[PDB]
Amino acid sequence: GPVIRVAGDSTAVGEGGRWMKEMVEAWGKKTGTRVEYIDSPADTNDRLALYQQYWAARSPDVDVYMIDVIWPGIVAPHALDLKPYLTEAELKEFFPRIVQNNTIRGKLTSLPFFTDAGILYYRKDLLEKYGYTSPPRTWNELEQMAERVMEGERRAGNRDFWGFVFQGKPYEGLTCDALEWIYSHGGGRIVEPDGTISVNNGRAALALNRAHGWVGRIAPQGVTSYAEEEARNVWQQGNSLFMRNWPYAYALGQAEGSPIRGKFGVTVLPKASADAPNAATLGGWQLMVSAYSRYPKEAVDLVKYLASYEVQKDNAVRLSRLPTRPALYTDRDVLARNPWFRDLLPVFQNAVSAPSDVAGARYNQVSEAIWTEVHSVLTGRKKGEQAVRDLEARIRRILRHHHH
């Protein structure tokens, strides 16, 4: 029979690739269909370029792709419209904001699979040891706590110990961290939903200068090369007070044999002041049937299975990744495993999207501009003031003649 081939997630990031292969194999066994899993690189922007080689070729060699929340406007021509395959009631079982993100000129490009939000991981054992009773609410507090805990852990012999790790590599992840920095200082959304390029302002500049001030001080010098997993591995070994990352890291830190099992919590990221908005970048992944698949019926069946209640449940319970179905947020087993899903639900509801809707098919290019200018601040090459001016000019060139 047909072989249904899937590219989605990466064995280089946590358990997501191993789990995705396992779910696809489970569907193949359940339906009696042959399946193959094709692995992907870690970083989302590398995966986009890989998948684009298949799409440019109209290649039938991959039937199902796991696509980023930032991709529908880019990838729509390469997606099979799923709208005729789902009833209205089936579609209403997902969060409507995500179904809307995935719908481009009326084409339902992809089913919501899991959502994502940037959060603050913190070592609660260490906060207690150093006399703090809550995690930091402001970035100034985060800095003060990091400096104090670092001084003590270094003095006690831990040469590897840092205050804060995050994603400072030049790739999409840095755009996500930087949107949080800027938005949490009252600096805006970089490009607003209405199209205004707003980034050249003093609050955004401050945000970026502040992040530079961490590098080599409370965060490792090498943080300018860290993606999700580089940060996570410093954290997970017990060597960081704080980490910014996504929900997937929680299950991994609780695993048997994790040095930090039972020693951490999560909360909203800090902000510049009490009247700034909370910032959590909205992420997440979707399930797309290739417009070039020779087997659309089977591929749609696999996509509906992966997006189903029990597979999203398994993703929540085993991998601590956030469902796209509201009903799972009231499931007793989901909540007992991950009580913080309830505690942070409003952080997840208020998450701020990167500017993929307004940049549309040009989002790749806009984000590359953001991460490169932000990286130039983190490296010390430019100050935030210069970087936000140069970034404004670059985004202006990229989006000239683009209407939304």
Ligand SMILES: OC[C@H]1O[C@@](CO)(O[C@H]2O[C@H](CO)[C@@H](O)[C@H](O)[C@H]2O)[C@@H](O)[C@@H]1O
């Ligand atoms: O493969 C899925 C896996 O990717 C992550 C990052 O490791 O996705 C998040 O981070 C990306 C940026 O690096 C975002 O573009 C994406 O939207 C966001 O979901 C993990 O969180 C996720 O489990």
